[PDB]
Symmetry: C2
Subunit: 367 residues, 2 copies
């Protein structure tokens, strides 16, 4: 067979929610979207007026660069280890994405890494929480606050992560989540925005709805917006997935701890570093580090043995589309030494033991 | 109770498709999207290579304006009776939407209306098929062919409409469809693109996938694209809705014919003009025309009686965001005299008789 790196778990509970939406006859953005937004805001510890449901996280990232007003001559700092949609959201506006480095052991940037790229042109910072680890999020948010620079949190890895009881995505100025088929809370497709400023959230609702502002069929256009909204079919699924999310993360956590127990004695292999005090992870990735000369061979050997692996996220500063970038040794090293092992709540205990054994046997053969 | 103007019909067959997609664990773009594309392409009578699934019709409209390369200094002609997302797709690129008039009886533009707005800067023409009526589509396509101007068909009203056996959305250069909650073939949210040029379809697939192109996790970026794809959950619903589409249209057709029977000899009211020979409609709108002094009072009265009505599409040449426009008497008159009655395959015979009765009684009281 084949053990996947990512996998969602939707079933009869989610189907029953879809059934009610079909039977209601209202499948577009409606009462289910309001409920899911309020449910998610409670999950974050924010008001319901601060959260805006969108079609996907990429669209949320694009909208945030539009709302922040970035454009030609501006710069937006984000780690080279970022989702390609983040850099595209910057570049499509005419702004220049400026890539900072990361700690190769965590693939998260430190506050110093971010600060080394800030300048008079910086109009925003974008950061993710690699694998669910918040990283240096608190010091980064404090840095951007002192510099007067808006901080956008791409929280797609960290739907349930917290620092000292504060949900990731709420420490900066804008938070963006993904609910696509590869994440944890999964609605097929779907995204969420969270604005520290409620008035900026009100602009997002209008912009996501074609820039419209409303006999009752006439309207005005305040911006040439796209259609960036989700629907009640996805939202009703989201409320169910949100209730199951703690169970998902608990299962992902015990799998990760079993990985630690089975792989922490292996020479030439580094498991993920421990979570800092007061940090909780969503356990989105389980990344192992090895010598660069065997990382690719490991992935190919594991693929032949029925264990799929991959790497996230490809260093965007090596993508020539984004212009002349410099050297980023942390991201360059991680891109050569890191491999992501399967980690999701659909893994059986048999799959977990298969991954552990195939990784041990693979390393012994390549060393 | 309330009788709605638009309403989808999704039930057990659509649920069973969602169920097996949930069980497969592959919810993103996969084999079900390929099947739905192949199914829809056969429905249109075109090759599967020409068709590209997208997140929604608005996104398909924005993508087409991007692929065609419209920008500052360019102009795109479209009727004032167009969807707001079509005009936003033009103005967001820096191009100027140039609105043309429409026939007030059909709310569709003639080839003469489009020609009067063609000029040196015209880089594209966008047209829809109001209510499912193809209109002057053949002459419009021939005019754009003679002028060398690409023609984009917003076919959201005409998912099953044809002219002489040819599907609407396949006569111009690009066709776009909507599967949102208010259309006929409904997948919650969903879009479709059809290109006459297969190489342009290949560009659309890459642009819709964040502009990415081709160890296996590394990529290159050829365009700062958004994430504009659909998923296999929506696609599996689409294949079910597509098989049911002929039955939906037949039910909508017999409703409109019952409407014609009960409202034809009513003074002060004008039913839709008959379809031209060789034209078939999807029966998306049933629009009636009356004196402007009673149109608004009619909608207020019908609302109080439990019959929802509305008008599509608000004349965009009166929206101040799109710059200074002139007078378009046809669209202006249509916006004051037209009212759209409930028309969807969820209407029961009792609902249809309630609409006819309230319309006849309302016009008798207001005249
Ligand atoms: C059933 C279903 N799942 C997920 C999505 C994602 O939104 C939609 C629409 O695309 C949907 O209709």
């Amino acid at each position: 067979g084949m053990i996947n790196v990512f996998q969602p778990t939707l079933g009869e509970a989610e189907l029953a929610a879809v059934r009610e939406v079909f039977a209601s006859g209202w499948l577009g953005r409606g009462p289910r979207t309001k409920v899911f937004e309020a449910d998610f805001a409670e999950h974050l510890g924010v008001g319901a007026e601060q959260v805006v449901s969108v079609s996907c996280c990429t669209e949320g990232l694009f909208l945030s660069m539009e709302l922040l007003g970035v454009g030609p001559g501006d710069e937006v700092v984000l780690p080279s280890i970022s989702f390609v949609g983040a850099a595209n959201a910057i570049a499509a506006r005419g702004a220049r994405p400026v890539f900072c480095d990361v700690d190769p052991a965590t693939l998260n940037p430190t506050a110093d890494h971010v600060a080394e790229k800030l300048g008079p042109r910086t109009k925003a910072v974008v950061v993710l929480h690699y694998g669910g680890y918040p990283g240096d999020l608190v010091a980064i948010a404090e840095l951007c606050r002192e510099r007067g620079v808006p901080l956008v949190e791409d929280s797609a890895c960290a739907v349930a992560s917290q620092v000292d009881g504060r949900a990731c995505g709420t420490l900066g100025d804008v938070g963006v989540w993904s609910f696509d088929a590869m994440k944890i809370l999964v609605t097929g497709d779907g995204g969420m925005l969270c604005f520290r400023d409620p008035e900026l959230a009100e602009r997002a609702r209008k912009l996501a709805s074609l820039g419209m502002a409303q006999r009752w069929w006439e309207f005005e256009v305040t911006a040439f917006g796209r259609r960036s909204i989700s629907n009640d079919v996805a939202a009703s699924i989201g409320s169910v997935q949100l209730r199951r999310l703690p169970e998902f993360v608990r299962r992902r956590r015990e799998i990760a701890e079993r990985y630690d127990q089975g792989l922490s004695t292996v020479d030439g292999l580094r498991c993920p570093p421990p979570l800092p005090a007061g940090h909780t992870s969503s356990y989105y990735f389980y990344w192992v580090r090895m010598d660069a000369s065997v990382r690719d061979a490991m992935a190919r050997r594991l693929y032949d043995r029925g264990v799929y692996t991959t790497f996230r996220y490809a260093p965007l500063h090596l993508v020539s589309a984004y212009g002349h970038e410099g050297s980023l040794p942390g991201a360059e090293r991680a891109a050569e030494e890191t491999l992501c092992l399967p980690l999701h709540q659909a893994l059986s205990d048999s799959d977990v033991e298969t991954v552990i054994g195939e990784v041990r046997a693979g390393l012994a053969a390549l060393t």
